[model samples]
Every structure is written in C-alpha cells, then in structure tokens.
Target: RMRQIEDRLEEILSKLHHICNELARIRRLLGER
Candidate 1:
C-alpha cells in the first residue's frame, strides 16, 4: 500500500520536472525575441 503511494508520488514529481523544463525553455525563447 505504502509502496504504491510512493510510486505515484514519484510519477507526479517526474511530470512536474518535465513541466518545469518546458517552462524554462519557453522563457529562454521569449528572452531571445
């Protein structure tokens, strides 16, 4: 049970990491313009 929760949390964190990377990329592109 606890292990499942941990797995889900990790999945969420990974998604957030991807989102943060995407936002950073957008910021860089905007700065170039």
Candidate 2:
C-alpha cells in the first residue's frame, strides 16, 4: 500500500506536471488554516 501510494504520487506528478504544485496548495489550504 505504501509503495502503491508512492507510485500514484509519481504518476500524478508526471500527469499534472504543471498543476501539481497548485493541487498540493489547494489540498493544503483545504486541510487547515
């Protein structure tokens, strides 16, 4: 499961090469102040 998660992260990073950071920021913003 941990390895799968890591693979998924790599897949996402490649697929959203430009928007990855934006997605990360949004997730962080939604999580807390």
Candidate 3:
C-alpha cells in the first residue's frame, strides 16, 4: 500500500515537473518578444 502511494506521488511530481518546464520555456519565449 505504501509503495502504491509513493508511485502515485511520483507520477504527479513527474507531471508537475514537465508542466513547470513547459511554463518556463513559454515565459522565456515571451520575454524574448
């Protein structure tokens, strides 16, 4: 059960990491303009 919870948390964190990276890229592009 604990392992399942950890897996889910890791999945969420991974998605958030991707989203943050995308947001950072977008911000950089906007800043360039």
**Candidate that would win on TM-score:** 1
Compute each candidate's TM-score over C-alphas.
Answer: 0.93, 0.48, 0.88
Cand. 3 TM to true fold: 0.88
Q: Tens digit of lDDT per residue, candidate 2, span 1-33?
A: 999999999998888976877899899999997
Judging by TM-score, tell me the better candidate of 1 and 3. Answer: 1
What TM-score, to 2 decimals, does candidate 1 have?
0.93
- Model 1 lDDT per residue over 1-33, tens place: 999999999999999999999999999999999
List candidate 3 stretches off by more than 4 Å: none
Which stretches in model 1 have alpha-carbon errors above 4 Å? none
Best-to-worst ranking by TM-score = 1, 3, 2
> Lowest summed lDDT over 10 consecutive residues: which window, candidate 1?
1-10
Per-residue lDDT tens digits of candidate 3, residues 1-33? 999999999999999999999999999999999
lDDT value, residue 9 of candidate 2: 99
What's the CA error at residue 31 for candidate 2, in Å?
36
Task: Give lDDT for model 2.
Answer: 0.90
